[PDB]
Symmetry: D2
Subunit: 267 residues, 4 copies
């Protein structure tokens, strides 16, 4: 069923990746934490609908930890899109539906803007576009702390702040949380400062390929208000889905329903 492997890109990234199913390609880009096990529960549900689903740990994170520092420092949506294109090319994928949340969502936008020939349709979720607007207060200062306390402020927050199902978030498992531990400071040093102003949100870029922009049902309106305003002004289908920042974690069944339903409209 699920297959796992490791492979290297000309960039020097040693990716860990997972695939399951057959049919049209769906690519699940993780959020900033870069832990693809968050997709573990949804993927089977997606693949069962007649799709081959692919995911991977992000460069420098979890089992993709063997990567050059430039791939997880000063990170931009454009660089992440290039990395996704690389791993995706190496996996002999031609053209695909892309899901992404947070920085991954930014990546999705960068994929729509700059590689439209490779996208059937895009699904971004809660894209950060402002300095500080991802959880609550400025993450952009967390880099000043020592690693242990960075991981401790981060793993102490994710449950109530956005991943608001303690049994599911914790159902990710202990090996995954141990990897996320080491992911937190790398994310804080490379993902908060640089990602927000790089999400391509211009009308023409958002319109190049079919785009379904979503927001967490229980997320406070102010966090990703700008997403809604931008999408609706650009004419992008914008909607809410159950959960907050990790709909695939807190509500895997509704996440797969949304993924499949949207993908089916653009086959």
């Amino acid at each position: 069923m699920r297959t796992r492997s490791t492979l290297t890109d000309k960039n020097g990234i040693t990716w860990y990746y997972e695939q399951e199913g057959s049919g049209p390609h769906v690519v699940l880009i993780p959020d900033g934490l870069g832990e693809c096990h968050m997709m573990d529960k949804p993927m089977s549900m997606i693949a069962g609908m007649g799709f081959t689903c692919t995911t991977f740990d992000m460069p420098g994170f979890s089992r993709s930890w063997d990567a050059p520092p430039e791939t997880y420092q000063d990170v931009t949506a454009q660089k992440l899109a290039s990395y996704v294109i690389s791993i995706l090319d190496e996996l002999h994928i031609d053209y695909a539906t892309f899901w992404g949340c947070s920085s991954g969502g930014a990546t999705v936008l960068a994929l729509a803007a700059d590689y439209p020939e490779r996208m059937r349709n895009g699904l971004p979720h809660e894209v950060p576009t402002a300095a500080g607007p991802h959880f609550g207060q400025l993450l952009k200062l967390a880099e000043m702390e020592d690693e242990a306390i960075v991981k401790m402020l981060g793993e102490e927050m994710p449950k109530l702040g956005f991943g608001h199902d303690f049994t599911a978030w914790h159902e990710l498992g202990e090996e995954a949380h141990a990897r996320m531990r080491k992911n937190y400071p790398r994310w804080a040093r490379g993902y908060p400062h640089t990602l927000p102003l790089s999400s391509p949100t211009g009308k023409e870029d958002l319109i190049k390929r079919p785009l379904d922009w979503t927001v967490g049902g229980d997320t406070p309106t102010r966090m990703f208000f700008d997403n809604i305003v931008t999408a609706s002004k650009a004419g992008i289908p914008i909607a809410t889905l159950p959960g907050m920042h990790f709909p695939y974690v807190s509500h895997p069944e509704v996440l797969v329903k949304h993924i499949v339903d949207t993908t089916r409209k653009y086959l």
Copy 2:
């Protein structure tokens, strides 16, 4: 300071009203509960900025409870707008800034659509427009229950669902909560089933007068998402202010700052 009185208008409504300050007129329309004491803390702060602030209990609610049944049964935004115009005329207010949340917001829009000559600028907050767009549990069924259980289901829900400031929600005082208890079943019989369909949200009505549409910063996105989409597509300035459904209760200082700042742009 605060002046209070009771007066009858031609509809047969014996209004209770409050006024404070001097200067341009600001009218604070209550939410569906119709209890104007929720504005008690904000009003002084607004009036201190050089404004005459007027509020009142809604027909059939609290100290305006002595009113004909049609004024609080099968309630529509149009009926509420006519009642507000009546009380505004008798207080001989010519033209005013109007604030309204929920049904009051629906009233404000109805005031923009059908009485634009009387409105200087409008402020609606969290306008109900759908049978499902509400952070409760299908209000439109509550009318089937007994009065006591309607009021107790009511008073248990808005404190965390609609205010999220328990000490502030509760500082309203017990005479006010005593009125609100008796308001709850009347609200359930007359405000959930008829009011959502009646808010005029067409572009043409929304553009007649200056309009600042707001949503609670801490409201989860799905509750009034439609408000955001509609306002942004129509070109209406839309933003978030601290609080949820009762910003004047949970966050009075920022509520008055918002009211004053917006009103000052349109004198």
Copy 3:
């Protein structure tokens, strides 16, 4: 089934009281708030088991608030016991089971100590014996504040501090909370400073009559730890029943089961 009245005893207290049922007498003494509507749901369930249940508002509180200041200032367990004896005499009760929580529980203990001829068996719940028993807020300080802020510190804390069944706490209804609001400053001025030192907890006094001492199952252990230690060292049957400080509000059915079961062992 319920009968209500008012009557005056020799102290000058104008009591409000309620009675229901027939059979052996059970008297439910309120907690410090002195609001007998907290027993509204339990009483019927007790009365249906073949008992006439009597309750009343405490002197100076709710509908018994027309009372001399001496009856609700510098309050002691002994004074409360004498008042309860007076009201019971006027109601032509000779002999009865007594329930009491907090100061009422203190009253029960004093009734066991000084009026053993009048009680068949006693039930006290979470009797305060120390200064500022509650962990977080020092009740012994509330008297320094003004009435509004006292009532707001009170009505705002009891719900999660004392009941943790919010839907039950307010189904008490509007009038009950309206009375309790005004009860708070009187309780704060008269009940935290003097009641804890007056509970008769000597071995011989606790043994004069059958005594079942209870603590809320969900109460933090330290709040009424002393109750457990004292009762168990004296050989008094001590157990917990569902709820915290207001078991008759949060858990009426198990409260009535406990009252009936214990009373049934001593007719």
Copy 4:
């Protein structure tokens, strides 16, 4: 500094142990999870008071998991006491103060009952003595589930149920939580069926050595009510300390103050 090593005892247990400081011996036995990193913050604070502190992971758990199945199946307080005696002998500790919570507390009691010559004074906390003196699901059924879901109900419950300082509980770190993951199913299969009944709580056993029995300040009264009743009836010093089930995690400083003060009274 803290010293770390591994060693083998006659039972076939590959123990991981930690030691710090000099002076009289204080031994900190883990709760059922058997993870001694929970003592990481307290130990230094104890050592600074002039004590050599020793702790270890319990057989079959965390870094002591390489152990024969009999040491973590059908676990009794007596077996755990014998294992603890083995590890203390191997570290050539003669006589010491022992702290223990939950099963570790049961062990402490078993050490007082059956090895009193080795105990300076004993400190047990929240000893399980019944199959049902908690709130929710019967722990004795958890073994019927698959390991992943066993770990998932455990890690999802204790943070708010037993160890309630989420920032501290999570401050344990991810390597520790990764070990605790694999600890959960072994605990469920070997610790809840058999342990509650093996704690020696008879008066004669409890009096053999100085014993201070404690309960969590914020623990609900019903969880370890039996502990309070038993200790008070036997004449054992019984008191509350800040926290719930993991005081050394949630409130390390006061845990260390308690350990040191009690130990110093019996040096």
